Design an enzyme around this catalytic site. Structure first.
Site, PDB file in Angstrom:
ATOM      1  N   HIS A 174       0.800  -1.220   0.000  1.00 48.64           N
ATOM      2  CA  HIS A 174       0.000   0.000   0.000  1.00 48.64           C
ATOM      3  C   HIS A 174       0.838   1.279   0.000  1.00 48.64           C
ATOM      4  CE1 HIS A 174      -0.062  -0.347   4.612  1.00 48.64           C
ATOM      5  NE2 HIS A 174       0.147   0.949   4.477  1.00 48.64           N
ATOM      6  N   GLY A 214       2.848   5.834  10.233  1.00 49.74           N
ATOM      7  CA  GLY A 214       4.186   5.702   9.713  1.00 49.74           C
ATOM      8  C   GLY A 214       4.887   4.431  10.132  1.00 49.74           C
ATOM      9  N   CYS A 217       3.950   1.282   9.434  1.00 46.55           N
ATOM     10  CA  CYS A 217       3.841   0.172   8.505  1.00 46.55           C
ATOM     11  C   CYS A 217       5.204  -0.227   7.944  1.00 46.55           C
ATOM     12  CB  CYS A 217       2.898   0.498   7.355  1.00 46.55           C
ATOM     13  SG  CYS A 217       1.228   0.421   7.925  1.00 46.55           S
TER      14      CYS A 217
END
Ligand SMILES: *[C@H](O)[C@H](C[C@@H]1CCNC1=O)NC(=O)[C@H](CC(C)C)NC(=O)OC1CC2(CCN(C(=O)OC(C)(C)C)CC2)C1
Lengths: 297, 298
Positions: B39, B141, B143
Site C-alpha cells: 500500500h 508511519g 507500517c
C-alpha cells in the site's frame, strides 16, 4: 506496551572477559573495556575480597578479552570503584556516541542482557526507590549494561553485579558506584523497604485513559498534601510539584487534572481493584515514566 | 517473568524507508531486495478500495524512493507478491544477517522493532493472538516494521505491519505478504474473531510455576486431549493442537509432569477457579509466554 530502546548500538560493544575460571561481560568503548571488578575473584575470594590486594597481584595477561572469535590484547588495567577498566590495543570501530550518567530512582532504562559476551535479550527496567532493579539476570549476566538513547547518543547508566535473596538485582553506574547500600561481596544482602513510584503510576493511569479505559476515574479531588499522606501510608513515594508539572502534557491531553488523577489513585489504594484490571494488569504498574508514556502515545 | 525482546541490532541494520509521492513507510533490505507493504503505492483515496494491480502497472522503478538514512538506494526492478512489494536494488546490504522467512502459529511470540521513516524507535515482545491480531504500539508511519525471532545468529522474520483494526489491535502479513487471519489491506472497517486465551502458553506458565516450586495446583488425575479441548472451549480457551502438545515436550521432561496431567490441573483451575490462591504471585493466568520463552527465562 513496555518498550525498550533499540539495542544495536550497545550490542556492538559487548565482549567477553575471563580471569581464571570466572567469565562475564565487558563493555568495549574506544580502547577500554569496562567490567565488574569481581571477575578477578575466585570462589573463596568472593566471600570477603580485598580488591586492591587482589588487583595488584594480577597481570594484564591474566585477563582474556574476546570480541567474538578475536582476542583483544590487554595492555593496561585500572580499577575505578567497583569497575575494572582494561586498556586494549585495538579501538572498537562500532563505538557509538555515548556518555555515562547516574540515574535517579524512578527513572527507566533498557537492559541488554548478555552471556559470554553475547547479547540475549533486551527489556525495560526502572531504578527502584530502594535502588534495586527488578531484572531478569542469570548466572553469567554480570557486566550487562543498562542505557537510554537520545538522538544517536547512548547514555549508559547501569552495569550489572549481583542478585539479592529476594530475587531482585543490584549494580553500579559506569563509574563503578553502586546504586543503593550494596557491596560486591558474596553475602546475603537485603534492601531497604521498597516503595511504589507514584508519578509513574499516575502516568500509566493516564495511558489507560488515552487507551479509552476510565472505569477507575471519579469526580472527587484532593489536595497534593492530602494525597501524599495517603500515598505514604500505602508505601507510595510522595508526589512533588515537579512531578505534577511533568504530568501536564498527559493532563492536557486527556483533560484530567493531575490532582483529579491523584484522587482516582487514592480510591484504588483504599478500595483495591475489586477484580477489575487496568490495561490488562491486576496490579498498578509503576515502571513507565511520563516520558515513556508520552513518547509512545 | 518479564516480556523480554530479542536484541534488535541485526534487524536495525536492515531497516530502510520507501516513499511513493508523499506516502512513506518502512522496508526491510536483505541482500539486494527491499520488502515493504504494497500500500505504499496508494494515495489517500486509493486506500478506500485500491486496485493494486492497476496501481502497480502505472508505477516504474524510478517512482520509488528507497533510502537508508538519507542515502538513496536505486531501484532496478519491482514486483508484487501477495500484499508485499519487492523492490530490487543495485546494492546488496552489507549488514544482511543470516535469515529466514517463517510463518508463525497463533500463540507464538516475537519481537517487533517499531520504526518510523526507516528509523527504529523501540523494541518489544508481541504475541500473535488466536484471532490473528497483535496488541502492538504502532503509530502512523509504522507500517513495514517487522517482527522476528533470533535463533543462534539467524533472524527468522515472521511479521510485517500493515494496519490497525477499529478495536485498536493490529494486523499484518508474513514476509511473503500473506496476511495472518481474515484481513485485507483496504481502509475499510474489518472485525477480528472474538479472541480466546492461548492455552499452550498458559500450560507453559504452569510448568514455569512448578519449576520455581509453586505447585499447589497439581492434582492426582489426567485427561484425554479431546475431553480437555471440549471443556477448554467452554471457558474461551483455544483448543490444543498436536504441535502444541509437542512444543510442551521439553517442559514436561524438565518437570516430569505429563502434558495431559498438566491439562487436568488446568481444567480443575478453570472449573473451580483459584479459590483465593496465587500462582507465581498472581491470581491471573498468563498466556503471552511460550514454552520457549519460559525456558529462556528459567
Ligand atoms: C554475575 O554474573 C553474577 C550475577 C548473578 C548470578 C545469579 N543472578 C545474578 O544476577 N553475580 C554474582 O554472582 C555475585 C558476585 C559477588 C562477588 C558480588 N553474587 C551474587 O549475585 O550472589 C548470589 C546470587 C544469589 C543466589 C541464591 N539466591 C536465590 O536463589 O534467590 C532466589 C530468589 C532464586 C530464591 C539469592 C541470589 C546469591
Amino acid at each position: 506496551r513496555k518498550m525498550a530502546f533499540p539495542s544495536g548500538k550497545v550490542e556492538g560493544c559487548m565482549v567477553q572477559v575471563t580471569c581464571g575460571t570466572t567469565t562475564l561481560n565487558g563493555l568495549w568503548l574506544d580502547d577500554v573495556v569496562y567490567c565488574p571488578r569481581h571477575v578477578i575473584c575466585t570462589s573463596e575470594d568472593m566471600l570477603n575480597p580485598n580488591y586492591e590486594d587482589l588487583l595488584i597481584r594480577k597481570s594484564n595477561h591474566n585477563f582474556l578479552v574476546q570480541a567474538g572469535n578475536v582476542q583483544l590484547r590487554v595492555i593496561g588495567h585500572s580499577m575505578q570503584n567497583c569497575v575494572l577498566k582494561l586498556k586494549v590495543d585495538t579501538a572498537n570501530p562500532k563505538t557509538p556516541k555515548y556518555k555515562f550518567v547516574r540515574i535517579q530512582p524512578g527513572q527507566t532504562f533498557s537492559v541488554l542482557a548478555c552471556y559470554n559476551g553475547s547479547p540475549s535479550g533486551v527489556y525495560q527496567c526502572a531504578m527502584r526507590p530502594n535502588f534495586t532493579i527488578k531484572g531478569s539476570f542469570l548466572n553469567g549476566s554480570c557486566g550487562s549494561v543498562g542505557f537510554n538513547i537520545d538522538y544517536d547518543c547512548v547514555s549508559f547508566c547501569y552495569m550489572h553485579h549481583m542478585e539479592l535473596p529476594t530475587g531482585v538485582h543490584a549494580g553500579t553506574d559506569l563509574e563503578g558506584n553502586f546504586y543503593g547500600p550494596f557491596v560486591d561481596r558474596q553475602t546475603a544482602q537485603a534492601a531497604g523497604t521498597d516503595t511504589t513510584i507514584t508519578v509513574n503510576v499516575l502516568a500509566w493511569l493516564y495511558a489507560a485513559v488515552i487507551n479509552g479505559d476510565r472505569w477507575f476515574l471519579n469526580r472527587f479531588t484532593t489536595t497534593l498534601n492530602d494525597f501524599n499522606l495517603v500515598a505514604m501510608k500505602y508505601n507510595y513515594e510522595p508526589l512533588t510539584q515537579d512531578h505534577v508539572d511533568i504530568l501536564g502534557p498527559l493532563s492536557a491531553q486527556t483533560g484530567i487534572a493531575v490532582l483529579d488523577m491523584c484522587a482516582s489513585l487514592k480510591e484504588l489504594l483504599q478500595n483495591g481493584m475489586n477484580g477489575r484490571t487496568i490495561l490488562g494488569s491486576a496490579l498498578l504498574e509503576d515502571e513507565f515514566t511520563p516520558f515513556d508514556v508520552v513518547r509512545q502515545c
